[PDB]
């Protein structure tokens, strides 16, 4: 019927690589930061009454 209107698989992978490279170019480093910065062994599980 209709023919040659959609990409192949390989071209889709190539376009996805191009998009990934562009997005990495905009944002070279990981922006997000986490309050917990160490492994579970370092932290000490304690319970407190209400703050102050």
């Amino acid at each position: 019927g209709i023919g040659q209107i959609h990409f192949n698989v390989e071209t889709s992978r190539k376009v996805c690589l191009d998009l990934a490279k562009s997005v990495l170019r905009l944002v070279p480093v990981y922006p997000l930061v986490s309050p917990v910065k160490k492994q579970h062994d370092d932290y000490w599980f304690v319970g407190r009454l209400g703050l102050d």
Binding site: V36, D42, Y43, V46, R48, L49, G50, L51
Partner: protein
């Protein structure tokens, strides 16, 4: 208790375990820093088009 015949007086010893408010937190061993809150770190990306 009323059905069985006890009348006119009640004394209750409030428990040690339940009547107060409380918190739980991580305490770092090197420094006394308390972490009580949580967060989700995720990076959604939206694909829209044809």
């Amino acid at each position: 208790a009323y059905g069985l015949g006890y009348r006119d007086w009640w004394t209750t010893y409030i428990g040690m375990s339940h009547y107060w408010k409380g918190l739980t937190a991580f305490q770092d061993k090197e420094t006394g820093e308390l972490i009580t809150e949580q967060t989700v770190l995720d990076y959604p990306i939206l694909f829209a088009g044809e």
